[PDB]
Design a protein around this ligand. Sequence first.
Ligand SMILES: CC(=O)N[C@H]1[C@H](O[C@H]2[C@@H](O)[C@@H](CO)O[C@@H](O[C@H]3[C@H](O)[C@@H](O)[C@H](O)O[C@@H]3CO)[C@@H]2O)O[C@H](CO)[C@@H](O[C@@H]2O[C@H](CO[C@]3(C(=O)O)C[C@H](O)[C@@H](NC(C)=O)[C@H]([C@H](O)[C@H](O)CO)O3)[C@H](O)[C@H](O)[C@H]2O)[C@@H]1O
Ligand SMILES: CC(=O)N[C@H]1[C@H](O[C@H]2[C@@H](O)[C@@H](CO)O[C@@H](O[C@H]3[C@H](O)[C@@H](O)[C@H](O)O[C@@H]3CO)[C@@H]2O)O[C@H](CO)[C@@H](O[C@@H]2O[C@H](CO[C@]3(C(=O)O)C[C@H](O)[C@@H](NC(C)=O)[C@H]([C@H](O)[C@H](O)CO)O3)[C@H](O)[C@H](O)[C@H]2O)[C@@H]1O
Ligand SMILES: CC(=O)N[C@H]1[C@H](O[C@H]2[C@@H](O)[C@@H](CO)O[C@@H](O[C@H]3[C@H](O)[C@@H](O)[C@H](O)O[C@@H]3CO)[C@@H]2O)O[C@H](CO)[C@@H](O[C@@H]2O[C@H](CO[C@]3(C(=O)O)C[C@H](O)[C@@H](NC(C)=O)[C@H]([C@H](O)[C@H](O)CO)O3)[C@H](O)[C@H](O)[C@H]2O)[C@@H]1O
Ligand SMILES: *[C@@H]1O[C@H](CO)[C@@H](O[C@@H]2O[C@H](CO)[C@@H](O[C@H]3O[C@H](CO)[C@@H](O)[C@H](O)[C@@H]3O)[C@H](O)[C@H]2NC(C)=O)[C@H](O)[C@H]1NC(C)=O
Ligand SMILES: *[C@@H]1O[C@H](CO)[C@@H](O[C@@H]2O[C@H](CO)[C@@H](O[C@H]3O[C@H](CO)[C@@H](O)[C@H](O)[C@@H]3O)[C@H](O)[C@H]2NC(C)=O)[C@H](O)[C@H]1NC(C)=O
Ligand SMILES: *[C@@H]1O[C@H](CO)[C@@H](O[C@@H]2O[C@H](CO)[C@@H](O[C@H]3O[C@H](CO)[C@@H](O)[C@H](O)[C@@H]3O)[C@H](O)[C@H]2NC(C)=O)[C@H](O)[C@H]1NC(C)=O
Ligand SMILES: *[C@@H]1O[C@H](CO)[C@@H](O)[C@H](O)[C@H]1NC(C)=O
Ligand SMILES: *[C@@H]1O[C@H](CO)[C@@H](O)[C@H](O)[C@H]1NC(C)=O
Ligand SMILES: *[C@@H]1O[C@H](CO)[C@@H](O)[C@H](O)[C@H]1NC(C)=O
Ligand SMILES: *[C@@H]1O[C@H](CO)[C@@H](O)[C@H](O)[C@H]1NC(C)=O
Ligand SMILES: *[C@@H]1O[C@H](CO)[C@@H](O)[C@H](O)[C@H]1NC(C)=O
Ligand SMILES: *[C@@H]1O[C@H](CO)[C@@H](O)[C@H](O)[C@H]1NC(C)=O
Ligand SMILES: *[C@@H]1O[C@H](CO)[C@@H](O)[C@H](O)[C@H]1NC(C)=O
Ligand SMILES: *[C@@H]1O[C@H](CO)[C@@H](O)[C@H](O)[C@H]1NC(C)=O
Ligand SMILES: *[C@@H]1O[C@H](CO)[C@@H](O)[C@H](O)[C@H]1NC(C)=O
Ligand SMILES: *[C@@H]1O[C@H](CO)[C@@H](O)[C@H](O)[C@H]1NC(C)=O
Ligand SMILES: *[C@@H]1O[C@H](CO)[C@@H](O)[C@H](O)[C@H]1NC(C)=O
Ligand SMILES: *[C@@H]1O[C@H](CO)[C@@H](O)[C@H](O)[C@H]1NC(C)=O
Ligand SMILES: *[C@H]1O[C@H](CO)[C@@H](O)[C@H](O)[C@H]1NC(C)=O
Ligand SMILES: *[C@H]1O[C@H](CO)[C@@H](O)[C@H](O)[C@H]1NC(C)=O
Ligand SMILES: *[C@H]1O[C@H](CO)[C@@H](O)[C@H](O)[C@H]1NC(C)=O
Lengths: 491, 491, 491
Amino acid sequence: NSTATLCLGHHAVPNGTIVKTITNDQIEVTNATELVQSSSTGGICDSPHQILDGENCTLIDALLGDPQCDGFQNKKWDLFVERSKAYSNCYPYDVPDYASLRSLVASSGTLEFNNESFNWTGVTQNGTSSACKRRSNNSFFSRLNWLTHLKFKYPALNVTMPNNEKFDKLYIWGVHHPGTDNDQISLYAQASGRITVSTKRSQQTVIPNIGSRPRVRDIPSRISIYWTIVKPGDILLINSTGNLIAPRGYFKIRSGKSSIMRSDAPIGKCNSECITPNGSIPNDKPFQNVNRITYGACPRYVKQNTLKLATGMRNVPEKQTAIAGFIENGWEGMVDGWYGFRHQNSEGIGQAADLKSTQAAINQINGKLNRLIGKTNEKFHQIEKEFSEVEGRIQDLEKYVEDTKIDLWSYNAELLVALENQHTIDLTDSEMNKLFERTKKQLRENAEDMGNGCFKIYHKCDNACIGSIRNGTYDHDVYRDEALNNRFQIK
Amino acid sequence: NSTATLCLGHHAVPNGTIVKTITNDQIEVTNATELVQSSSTGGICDSPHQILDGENCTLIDALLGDPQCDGFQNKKWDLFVERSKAYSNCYPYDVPDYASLRSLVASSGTLEFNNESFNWTGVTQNGTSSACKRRSNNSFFSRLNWLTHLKFKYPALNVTMPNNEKFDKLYIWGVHHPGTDNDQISLYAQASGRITVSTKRSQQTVIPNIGSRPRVRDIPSRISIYWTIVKPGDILLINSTGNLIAPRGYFKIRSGKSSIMRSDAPIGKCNSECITPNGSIPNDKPFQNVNRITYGACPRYVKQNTLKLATGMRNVPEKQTAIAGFIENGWEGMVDGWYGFRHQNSEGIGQAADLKSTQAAINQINGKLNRLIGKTNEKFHQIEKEFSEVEGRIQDLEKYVEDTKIDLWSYNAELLVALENQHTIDLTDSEMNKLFERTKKQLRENAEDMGNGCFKIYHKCDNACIGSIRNGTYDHDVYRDEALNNRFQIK
Amino acid sequence: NSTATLCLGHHAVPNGTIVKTITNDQIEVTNATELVQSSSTGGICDSPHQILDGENCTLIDALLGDPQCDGFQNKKWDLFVERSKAYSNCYPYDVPDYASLRSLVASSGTLEFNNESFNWTGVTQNGTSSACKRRSNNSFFSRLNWLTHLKFKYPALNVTMPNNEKFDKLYIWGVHHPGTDNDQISLYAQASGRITVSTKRSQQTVIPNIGSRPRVRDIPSRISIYWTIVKPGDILLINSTGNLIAPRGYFKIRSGKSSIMRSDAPIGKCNSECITPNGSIPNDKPFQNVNRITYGACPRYVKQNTLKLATGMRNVPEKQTAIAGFIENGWEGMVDGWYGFRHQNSEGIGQAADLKSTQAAINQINGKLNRLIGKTNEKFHQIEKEFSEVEGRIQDLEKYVEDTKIDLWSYNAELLVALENQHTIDLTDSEMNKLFERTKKQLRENAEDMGNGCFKIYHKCDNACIGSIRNGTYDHDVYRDEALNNRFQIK
Ligand SMILES: CC(=O)N[C@H]1[C@H](O[C@H]2[C@@H](O)[C@@H](CO)O[C@@H](O[C@H]3[C@H](O)[C@@H](O)[C@H](O)O[C@@H]3CO)[C@@H]2O)O[C@H](CO)[C@@H](O[C@@H]2O[C@H](CO[C@]3(C(=O)O)C[C@H](O)[C@@H](NC(C)=O)[C@H]([C@H](O)[C@H](O)CO)O3)[C@H](O)[C@H](O)[C@H]2O)[C@@H]1O
Ligand SMILES: CC(=O)N[C@H]1[C@H](O[C@H]2[C@@H](O)[C@@H](CO)O[C@@H](O[C@H]3[C@H](O)[C@@H](O)[C@H](O)O[C@@H]3CO)[C@@H]2O)O[C@H](CO)[C@@H](O[C@@H]2O[C@H](CO[C@]3(C(=O)O)C[C@H](O)[C@@H](NC(C)=O)[C@H]([C@H](O)[C@H](O)CO)O3)[C@H](O)[C@H](O)[C@H]2O)[C@@H]1O
Ligand SMILES: CC(=O)N[C@H]1[C@H](O[C@H]2[C@@H](O)[C@@H](CO)O[C@@H](O[C@H]3[C@H](O)[C@@H](O)[C@H](O)O[C@@H]3CO)[C@@H]2O)O[C@H](CO)[C@@H](O[C@@H]2O[C@H](CO[C@]3(C(=O)O)C[C@H](O)[C@@H](NC(C)=O)[C@H]([C@H](O)[C@H](O)CO)O3)[C@H](O)[C@H](O)[C@H]2O)[C@@H]1O
Ligand SMILES: *[C@@H]1O[C@H](CO)[C@@H](O[C@@H]2O[C@H](CO)[C@@H](O[C@H]3O[C@H](CO)[C@@H](O)[C@H](O)[C@@H]3O)[C@H](O)[C@H]2NC(C)=O)[C@H](O)[C@H]1NC(C)=O
Ligand SMILES: *[C@@H]1O[C@H](CO)[C@@H](O[C@@H]2O[C@H](CO)[C@@H](O[C@H]3O[C@H](CO)[C@@H](O)[C@H](O)[C@@H]3O)[C@H](O)[C@H]2NC(C)=O)[C@H](O)[C@H]1NC(C)=O
Ligand SMILES: *[C@@H]1O[C@H](CO)[C@@H](O[C@@H]2O[C@H](CO)[C@@H](O[C@H]3O[C@H](CO)[C@@H](O)[C@H](O)[C@@H]3O)[C@H](O)[C@H]2NC(C)=O)[C@H](O)[C@H]1NC(C)=O
Ligand SMILES: *[C@@H]1O[C@H](CO)[C@@H](O)[C@H](O)[C@H]1NC(C)=O
Ligand SMILES: *[C@@H]1O[C@H](CO)[C@@H](O)[C@H](O)[C@H]1NC(C)=O
Ligand SMILES: *[C@@H]1O[C@H](CO)[C@@H](O)[C@H](O)[C@H]1NC(C)=O
Ligand SMILES: *[C@@H]1O[C@H](CO)[C@@H](O)[C@H](O)[C@H]1NC(C)=O
Ligand SMILES: *[C@@H]1O[C@H](CO)[C@@H](O)[C@H](O)[C@H]1NC(C)=O
Ligand SMILES: *[C@@H]1O[C@H](CO)[C@@H](O)[C@H](O)[C@H]1NC(C)=O
Ligand SMILES: *[C@@H]1O[C@H](CO)[C@@H](O)[C@H](O)[C@H]1NC(C)=O
Ligand SMILES: *[C@@H]1O[C@H](CO)[C@@H](O)[C@H](O)[C@H]1NC(C)=O
Ligand SMILES: *[C@@H]1O[C@H](CO)[C@@H](O)[C@H](O)[C@H]1NC(C)=O
Ligand SMILES: *[C@@H]1O[C@H](CO)[C@@H](O)[C@H](O)[C@H]1NC(C)=O
Ligand SMILES: *[C@@H]1O[C@H](CO)[C@@H](O)[C@H](O)[C@H]1NC(C)=O
Ligand SMILES: *[C@@H]1O[C@H](CO)[C@@H](O)[C@H](O)[C@H]1NC(C)=O
Ligand SMILES: *[C@H]1O[C@H](CO)[C@@H](O)[C@H](O)[C@H]1NC(C)=O
Ligand SMILES: *[C@H]1O[C@H](CO)[C@@H](O)[C@H](O)[C@H]1NC(C)=O
Ligand SMILES: *[C@H]1O[C@H](CO)[C@@H](O)[C@H](O)[C@H]1NC(C)=O
């Protein structure tokens, strides 16, 4: 009746989701996406990383050449997977600083071994044992050479092996600790004497220690395992009078991205960049709470089991019912846009979405998704994060380093999502406010703000007229005389 | 005189506090709260954690059973407190990797000890010394057994102890290093020979080393202390020909939240969750600069000695004097609200607080206090952070880890408080602006904005009329004819 | 023609720079500054830190007193610089835990050495070798004393040295490992026997190990180096029957800010607070990507090679052409201010800068530059971050600690610059909006907002009138009758 109403509004949905911002612990938005990966398939995918399943073998057992590990000879890996069921089935041994040798071989990523012709003149080679059977026969570690007396003599060994290669050589060797004095004489024909293995730059002396240890596979003796790395132009010197478990050659030692993981997860024929002990996980999300132990391009481990990123505006119920605008009121009936117009005029009541404002909001939200989704970074060999034995100081430090790191990342994740969500609420509120202001400015003196997100337009404004406002081509001068007469009359 | 004035405003106080935001290094606000705890009472509260005051005993001395520590037998703790006055008063000893044994016992949290019947047939037991008196008599460590020759014989010991329990056993044992060859013969009846202590999975051999060390309590000999952990189903084997300081049994080893702290603070009868070497501290605040060493639910250590969180709006002086609104002007006379109205009309000049806006600001500020106050997280056994000896590499790493951590937290604290304070300034400014806008919209064409946070209302507006605006029930149509005539007249 | 136009605007430049905000991956601003230092001069400046260039000497060689290092005697440093060309030229030696002794001497920062008169009665002193020539003559390490038999006797040494000083003493000593049994007898007149060096609180026993090692300077023997620190009131006891390489006295050990760095950069006569292996770097910027290894007041190492901080507003092209204001439009022709006014009236078209708004923006931007520029913090002795040998566990941890730290700082840097840039865009947009609003409020009913950042002023407004608006002294009442007649006429 000589006027029209034009309301600005935004959509609302019946099934909103709660997120956290800086302003609110809980605010309902139209939509959100999860940023913490909390599940795994349960299998380790065999692609795209080269996986070596240790099965019954530890890495160190595959290194030394336990008979059940013969199939591992010379293999390489990106990730060596050690199973909890693994067990040793050869001569009982220990490795002082086992963890370091495991780590350096793991990180090298290869079991490539080159045989060398050592001069073992004057002794018997290839000693074997019933504790280490190969094909039903008494045998020994494939890569080691148990030397013993020859005709009750064991002449002093003083043997040399130059490295004339352009790469480093890793030598694995050992010392036999016999159970009794009888065994020492039976084996080496004399009282026990130290072993010295040296290079130009380093030396290691080891003393065999005769004595009973608890029997393992009926063996009260032990072998202790040692290693030496020899640089190009340097030379290995082995100097011994008995009890030497000699190397048969050297391992290549490489540098690269290889590592080792303890897991019982089955290996599957599938493709996934991120491996955890629980299985591979998708790496679309920036964070994960599956496992602190990871390999490959992985989300960062956090303590939270959920962090929701807002991907829509505040969700506001529609007040019950004349048309009304956005002030404390969303429009559940607007489904083809995020923002729009409702009008009442001589021709009826209508709605239309505003594409520009809708797309501006969507684009910005898609931008922040692009920065956070699918952007994980790769890590490879790290530190151990679970321990089967009590050790004290070094382990305390490894644990504290990891705890420190996780708490700092968890804090960053918490803040980032709160900040981002606050920004999303702000940018979507801003698009609504900007649409209102643009409309107010078009209308000039021809309308008044009713306080509810609507304008009272003080002239006849048919569908085409409303359309012109929505399209930004309304000419206020055309209607100003009519509007001013209607506004500034005296009733 | 046919018009009225209505001003919107906010409170101000005579005693503001300076805070830091993103926008300003220094901005005065009405109120702030401290987020860094910088004082302690000076006492360690004996509740709610179980405290064991070591008094004159170190943990290791209480473990071995120095006579002054007899009262500690079998005790447990959450926190063992070692005093700087502590001193050893038994046979002089050392512990290779003392720090690891201290840590693992500390973390276990128990001195529970179970005696075992070892077969020491063929030797003399219970050797004692004047360096270790108990009840005026020559004695020895309670948990160790000094074995010596019997009738000038010391037969080879080869003794076994199975672990048929479902828990791990910790064995503490030692090697006696005599001062002279005479002492070696006097004690063990033969030349010194190695000691080997083994299990199915591990072995340790130790060689006694005869020689003078500087006398301590007139003793030039030493004992070196070692330990072995034995798993269920495994067995301890002790193999020796002399110089054995034998175990009398095993310690339980537990897992849990126990630790150890160096402090001289007195223990008080009080209750506090957070313990530092300086004493317990309140844990209401999120940060603290009392000590990097903490136990329990503690604020995080930061370098800052103060960080002030704004808990009110910007504090703005009242300009000297017609009434005026919030533009560059606070109202020191408004004491029953944070925001409000002042008016001038035919009936006088008045003020009233606006409850809604005040409560909206207060609630949001209380929300952020709730997130930051009383929300500390517990940490228990960590790494050492002060050192009495120079050590090199491992200590360099422990120090760098802690320095790294503190700098990262200090940075997070600095940013968080700057961000939060900026947000508080923004939300309180926003409540003022929203109140102004709501009022502007009610008034429609009946008022004009004077530019100083006040409206000139162009009609007679008595106390009830002003009240209607404040209460949001003002009907602009009632007054529009009057107002339009007054506004758009020609003077 | 009875009206005027007044536009509000902001400057724009032809050569903008792209930065990152929270809202935009790429937004062009008028100006930016770099926060990551990415270059070095290539030289280490000799001021203000005390630099000691090791030249051909390692620290350990200068400690022991290799003849080519005689010039280093008693020197101090803030930073010891070790060169890759360095080489040893004396008796072949090793140091078990070399890295720890290097670190503790490096951190101490002094080679001050005090000679002491040990009682070496009964042996020959000052043994020398052709492997260690000094001034063409056979010689030895300056700080060590090679003792050998006297008249084919080597009586048991049992020598004492009390520390009656108020500071700690560092003793460096060694054990000679002869190449053959012949050398052992030639040198010490008897079979090899252990060396024991002790104090009241500690003990070290070392066993000489006879054997061939690969010849170095024709020497198949080795010396192994050890150290002992003696506290005030404690005493050094040296107990040996041969193979002792004895100390000639002690090194002072100090605490302070000294360290050691590997670098081949030349030392220059210049002044710079921050040293890296690549050379000194300026420390104005908060971050750097030159080297993770630093000494002194240094920017923090990050992975990014550039991070640009906005130092101006959004840069917006001027739309082509009536005058127009800031809505989607910058003014390339405004060069004496950041914000200003353009007008059209009876006297022409003019421009003037607004000083207040310009200065408000500049001051705030200068504030944030002041917080970020020239504010670096000092670090001194840290951990090693590059390694020439494979080691396993400890090295894995040192690497993981550093990687962790760098990733956390890189994240903080990324967020900080995004937040700061968002804040800069917001504060500069805000100054534009505030200027517009202040002007709108002055004009009251005498103007209408044209929607393009300009006002249509509905009265004659000559240069002085425009000036009054700009200066904030425009009196709207003077013109209101004229303006209202022009606005609310009927055409
Ligand atoms: C080297 C050897 O075979 N040792 C056997 C050992 O042999 C001695 C024994 O037969 C006596 C009997 O009088 O004779 C000695 O020979 C002397 C001879 O009398 C004299 O004329 C001459 O001048 O001097 C020689 C000394 O050289 C024999 O030396 O017998 C004992 C008791 O039966 C064996 O102990 C048992 O070992 C069992 C495991 O057997 C192996 C194994 O591991 O499978 C056999 C391997 O061939 C042998 N390996 C090598 C490289 O020799 C190993 C090795 O000896 C041990 O593993 C070391 O711990 O033993 C099983 O452990 C059982 O429980 C033992 O009682 C011993 O092996
Ligand atoms: C084991 C013992 O008591 N050792 C004494 C030692 O005893 C020898 C001495 O009396 C000579 C004298 O001729 O006789 C020897 O006996 C031989 C005998 O002649 C011969 O017939 C027979 O066939 O062989 C035996 C050898 O077994 C004795 O062995 O005397 C010296 C010098 O007086 C003592 O040194 C002094 O020790 C003082 C501390 O005394 C204790 C202690 O710590 O309290 C007494 C303890 O009972 C003893 N503990 C045990 C378990 O035996 C310890 C222990 O020996 C030391 O602590 C080891 O370092 O000593 C104090 O240190 C003083 O300064 C020393 O001069 C030695 O203890
Ligand atoms: C101590 C010494 O000079 N050792 C020489 C060694 O001397 C023995 C040799 O001349 C025989 C010959 O019959 O005689 C021995 O003397 C005995 C004598 O016969 C007997 O009557 C008496 O009762 O007993 C003595 C034993 O004390 C000599 O002891 O000769 C060998 C072979 O020539 C030398 O080896 C060579 O060493 C070369 C390096 O020489 C130095 C060096 O480093 O410069 C000389 C230094 O003076 C010496 N330092 C000291 C403190 O003595 C060192 C030191 O011995 C070595 O470094 C230890 O490794 O050697 C070079 O290495 C060459 O390749 C070797 O063949 C040996 O040095
Ligand atoms: C030191 O004490 C050890 C523990 O008592 C002892 O170990 C053990 O020796 C016995 C036999 O001497 C083993 O028992 C085996 O012997 C029969 C003999 O034919 C075999 O048929 C069986 O396999 C039987 O198990 C024990 O297994 C073994 N115990 C342990 C824990 O290792 C050492 O022999 C003693 N050492 C010396 C040098 O005497
Ligand atoms: C190797 O040298 C050591 C240092 O000189 C020496 O240590 C000491 O020995 C003396 C006695 O021999 C102790 O002095 C004590 O002796 C009288 C004798 O009755 C007592 O009354 C007093 O208690 C007096 O203090 C020293 O205390 C002691 N010094 C140190 C630093 O330990 C060793 O005895 C020598 N070793 C050998 C095997 O000869
Ligand atoms: C154990 O084996 C070692 C390696 O074969 C051996 O080392 C070396 O000994 C030879 C001489 O015996 C050195 O050669 C030098 O000898 C002549 C003799 O006049 C000199 O003119 C030259 O300097 C020549 O180089 C080797 O340099 C040396 N090789 C290494 C790698 O060190 C040991 O001698 C053997 N040990 C025993 C105890 O026999
Ligand atoms: C909600 O958000 C996510 C991410 O933008 C999108 O993939 C999903 O389809 C959205 N859901 C709805 C119902 O719009
Ligand atoms: C591993 O050992 C188990 C148990 O001894 C055996 O049954 C299984 O066949 C073994 N697996 C492989 C792959 O050798
Ligand atoms: C090393 O070899 C030499 C002979 O070349 C010999 O005399 C010596 O005993 C050997 N050393 C050891 C520790 O076996
Ligand atoms: C993965 O395994 C770890 C270690 O056993 C366990 O703590 C965790 O609950 C597992 N997580 C998932 C998602 O299966
Ligand atoms: C200031 O703030 C704190 C925390 O909100 C509050 O406990 C205190 O009483 C306030 N002081 C005043 C004077 O309002
Ligand atoms: C601890 O030792 C001191 C000094 O010897 C003694 O006076 C005090 O009584 C001792 N305290 C306890 C609790 O045994
Ligand atoms: C261990 O016991 C055996 C006898 O069972 C003995 O012959 C041997 O000497 C002992 N070993 C040691 C190192 O004491
Ligand atoms: C607590 O003790 C530490 C360590 O001695 C000291 O540096 C610090 O000043 C103390 N802090 C307080 C608040 O007493
Ligand atoms: C741009 O910014 C920097 C830092 O404020 C300033 O030093 C430089 O001179 C500025 N450049 C221009 C062209 O204004
Ligand atoms: C260091 O050694 C090189 C190569 O032997 C020599 O030429 C140079 O003069 C030496 N420099 C110094 C400072 O002694
Ligand atoms: C230490 O000195 C004593 C004599 O005082 C001597 O008997 C003993 O052999 C020496 N010990 C060593 C390990 O050299
Ligand atoms: C500095 O040296 C390091 C280590 O060699 C190298 O990686 C880096 O590229 C260098 N940086 C610059 C800016 O020269
Ligand atoms: C062990 O040595 C024998 C000779 O005794 C040789 O024939 C054989 O090749 C060696 N065993 C190997 C290489 O497995
Ligand atoms: C030490 O052994 C004796 C027998 O020599 C025994 O009676 C006593 O119980 C033992 N001492 C203890 C358990 O304290
Ligand atoms: C080594 O001892 C000799 C006496 O044999 C002495 O004259 C000389 O000063 C000592 N050498 C030094 C201190 O360099």
